[PDB]
Amino acid sequence: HMIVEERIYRIRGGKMQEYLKLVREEGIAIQAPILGNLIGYFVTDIGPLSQVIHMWGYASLDDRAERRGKLAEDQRWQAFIPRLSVLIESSENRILLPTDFSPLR
Amino acid sequence: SDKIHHHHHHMIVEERIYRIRGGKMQEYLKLVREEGIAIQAPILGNLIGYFVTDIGPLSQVIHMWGYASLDDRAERRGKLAEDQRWQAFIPRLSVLIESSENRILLPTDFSPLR
Amino acid sequence: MIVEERIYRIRGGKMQEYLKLVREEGIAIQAPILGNLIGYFVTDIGPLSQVIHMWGYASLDDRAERRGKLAEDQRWQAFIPRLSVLIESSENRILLPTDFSPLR
Amino acid sequence: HMIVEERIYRIRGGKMQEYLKLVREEGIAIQAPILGNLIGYFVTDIGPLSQVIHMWGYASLDDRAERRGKLAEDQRWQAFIPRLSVLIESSENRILLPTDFSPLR
Amino acid sequence: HMIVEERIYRIRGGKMQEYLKLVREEGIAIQAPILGNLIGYFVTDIGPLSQVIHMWGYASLDDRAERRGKLAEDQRWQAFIPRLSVLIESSENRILLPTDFSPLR
Amino acid sequence: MIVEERIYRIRGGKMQEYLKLVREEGIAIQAPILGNLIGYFVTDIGPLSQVIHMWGYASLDDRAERRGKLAEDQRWQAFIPRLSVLIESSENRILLPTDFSPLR
Amino acid sequence: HMIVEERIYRIRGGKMQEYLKLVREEGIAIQAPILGNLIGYFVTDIGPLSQVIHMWGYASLDDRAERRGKLAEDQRWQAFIPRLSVLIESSENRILLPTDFSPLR
Amino acid sequence: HMIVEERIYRIRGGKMQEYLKLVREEGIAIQAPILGNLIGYFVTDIGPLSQVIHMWGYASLDDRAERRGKLAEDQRWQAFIPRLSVLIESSENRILLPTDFSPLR
Numbered sequence A, D, E, G, H: 001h002m003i004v005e006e007r008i009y010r011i012r013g014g015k016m017q018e019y020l021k022l023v024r025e026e027g028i029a030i031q032a033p034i035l036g037n038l039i040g041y042f043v044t045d046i047g048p049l050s051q052v053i054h055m056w057g058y059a060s061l062d063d064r065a066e067r068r069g070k071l072a073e074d075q076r077w078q079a080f081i082p083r084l085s086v087l088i089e090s091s092e093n094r095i096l097l098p099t100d101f102s103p104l105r
Numbered sequence B: 001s002d003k004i005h006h007h008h009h010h011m012i013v014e015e016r017i018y019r020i021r022g023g024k025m026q027e028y029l030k031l032v033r034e035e036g037i038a039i040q041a042p043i044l045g046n047l048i049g050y051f052v053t054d055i056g057p058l059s060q061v062i063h064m065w066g067y068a069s070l071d072d073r074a075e076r077r078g079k080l081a082e083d084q085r086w087q088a089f090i091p092r093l094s095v096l097i098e099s100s101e102n103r104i105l106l107p108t109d110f111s112p113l114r
Numbered sequence C, F: 001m002i003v004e005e006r007i008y009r010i011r012g013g014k015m016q017e018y019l020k021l022v023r024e025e026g027i028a029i030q031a032p033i034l035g036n037l038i039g040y041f042v043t044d045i046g047p048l049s050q051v052i053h054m055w056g057y058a059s060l061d062d063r064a065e066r067r068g069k070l071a072e073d074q075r076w077q078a079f080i081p082r083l084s085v086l087i088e089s090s091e092n093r094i095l096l097p098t099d100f101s102p103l104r
Helices: A016-035 A061-072 A075-085 B025-044 B070-082 B084-094 C015-034 C060-071 C074-084 D016-035 D061-073 D075-085 E016-035 E061-073 E075-085 F015-034 F060-072 F074-084 G016-035 G061-072 G075-085 H016-035 H061-073 H075-085
Strands: A003-011 A038-046 A051-058 A088-098 B012-020 B047-055 B060-067 B097-107 C002-010 C037-045 C050-057 C087-097 D003-011 D038-046 D051-058 D088-098 E003-011 E038-046 E051-058 E088-098 F002-010 F037-045 F050-057 F087-097 G003-011 G038-046 G051-058 G088-098 H003-011 H038-046 H051-058 H088-098
Touching: A003 A061, A003 B047, A016 A038, A016 A051, A016 A061, A016 A075, A038 B012, A038 H088, A051 A061, A061 A075, A061 C060, A088 D038, B012 B070, B025 B047, B025 B060, B025 B070, B025 B084, B047 C087, B060 B070, B070 B084, B070 H061, B097 G038, C002 C060, C002 D038, C015 C037, C015 C050, C015 C060, C015 C074, C037 D003, C037 E088, C050 C060, C060 C074, D003 D061, D016 D038, D016 D051, D016 D061, D016 D075, D051 D061, D061 D075, D061 E061, D088 F037, E003 E061, E003 F037, E016 E038, E016 E051, E016 E061, E016 E075, E038 G088, E051 E061, E061 E075, F002 F060, F015 F037, F015 F050, F015 F060, F015 F074, F050 F060, F060 F074, F060 G061, F087 H038, G003 G061, G003 H038, G016 G038, G016 G051, G016 G061, G016 G075, G038 H003, G051 G061, G061 G075, H003 H061, H016 H038, H016 H051, H016 H061, H016 H075, H051 H061, H061 H075
Parallel strands: none
Antiparallel strands: A003 A051, A003 A088, A038 A051, A038 B097, A088 B047, B012 B060, B012 B097, B047 B060, C002 C050, C002 C087, C037 C050, C037 D088, C087 D038, D003 D051, D003 D088, D038 D051, E003 E051, E003 E088, E038 E051, E038 F087, E088 F037, F002 F050, F002 F087, F037 F050, G003 G051, G003 G088, G038 G051, G038 H088, G088 H038, H003 H051, H003 H088, H038 H051
């Protein structure tokens, strides 16, 4: 019943530490409460490089939309997200459905 | 829900991403459900998640594995290759896989899973 | 309203076969259940042996519910394996119409 | 019969709302009458992100060429398009032929 | 002004010589008179491998559609193409517009 | 004979500037030294903001020598930085015409 | 002087061991003498999977052309290659030029 | 056995010679001792272009992780790497396992 969103960003060359600092020090404190279930947050060591992956869990897809909606209109997030966006070269996401044998489910 | 940490333990995460052959998803899943994960998990030691993509690249499976180091990973993946039940199991699974790739992810110090 | 874009690559030589299956059996089953087929296309210039189809929904919940109904439908279950063997690759995405999209 | 051109653009990080404002307030009023049959204009929510997709109907490809050539010589479009273009990281297109069971046909 | 179609096929591993034989001995003799203007036909030696590229000249895209439609209706092509298509793992095309300094224009 | 296909993606908005540079300055330096320009194209349908140019050579050692001469040419060293800044990505490949290829 | 060719293959799922068995026991004894300078032969453990990479050293690309010609025309190679090819899903290559600070050069 | 890492970078258009100057004159002297086993360093001439490839041999992935840790911490490297990184458009790595019949193994 739970769904997982995987977000995958390609960060501009040289800007990774900048990106992590903003999220570590400001972004995540705003975003996590609202979205509700940060599962994990990663920087790739082997594979595609200058890559961050974050996973978020949700009770449903319309719970997701409601939460993501609340985030988009949060004033602090509105101030924050333009500063992060300028460091992102490309992004994509996908909806993952856990199997009945997934520990995250 | 929330996680709570008091001391660091070093951990890496492997993401494996397979494109399954059209028409084979339920067969792939059934093999893993009924046989493979019961062999695989105890040996590799820390399964994190196992997913089928609903929006994105389709006929796609994604699974995550926690390890202490990359040598620990190598040690455990070598035990798995060496396991007799696995040797009989993996050829039946591998034939259903069109493509595969993996990568090593390092959790940030603010990752709940870490 | 949201639009799901599904994009399939079909096995070389099997395009007419795929379309025949959909035309004569699949779309009759699929369309009433899913509700709102927007378009169904074969690529002529671009990635080739490519089929693209678009479906409208009220929400992602609504989509999930309808597609679950489709997965549970006996005719679909008998049909989809014949179609799946012709699909070499597939992907999809969710599109939000802008406020100036004539389709919105 | 009718053909559909699908145009898929990757917009620079943080510039999506800027891009939309230009199209909403200027571009589309110029472009649409000349090109003739705007079918749809979308932003991707799940999949490749910071992506816009727009579809244009034409009676034939020679007619597409005539109309896109007209657009390119229009003096308002010339003044407009460079302001849009600096926000586009990547672009591509394709020619879709509707099936006899496509509602859009 | 002329247009050029570049068609790009990836051939199944081990099937190249078989693919080339079919085209050399059966296909191209049917195909070229009907499409009208075969420019070049190539096998990649360095790059994506087991790849053939072939380039076709047309006066216009409507002419292309008219000629490609005739090819599709031709009895000999219809008995032929299924044997070639089974060898094609993947395909794509694009329409190239020569520049005013292009030797081919 | 060998054909090299070079395929460039041009930064958004910079196409006309790329073509102007090559038209008025670049190709007059380049073609004589490289020796056999086959074609030069802009993609209208497919990957966009895309330039494709084809070059004929007697062999790959000849190519290496000729592209070597080009990179040492004073005029070309004065030109190429202005062109190069406009190219967002690039790739090339070597194509061997078949025995039934008109261009051979 | 010396050029490097990097060949990168994707092997059909489940066929890796069979592919290496063929190359180890029959292929490489034919191939390597004729091509002259096998630098290295690898299987990918992290990255794109079910992937082999082999690097060949050549004095020049004309010498490569001549030698690859000889290989293609070799009777032993001709008996061997079809059996390997059936296991190859896709392939690609590129020419690498060592820098003046490359130990391999 | 020994493991090989292949690092593959796409360099910004027009910045290649600037990239090589930095590595040739400063970077490689810092980096090669600390990592210990530079196999090769290449620029692609035919294939994906504006592409740099380098290879590093290691005894183990842990030993790799230790040496990359030392490399990261090195103060001369911290001053160098931001200057190189600004020229890199994208990067990726993979771990290769030499076959038992690879000369490099």
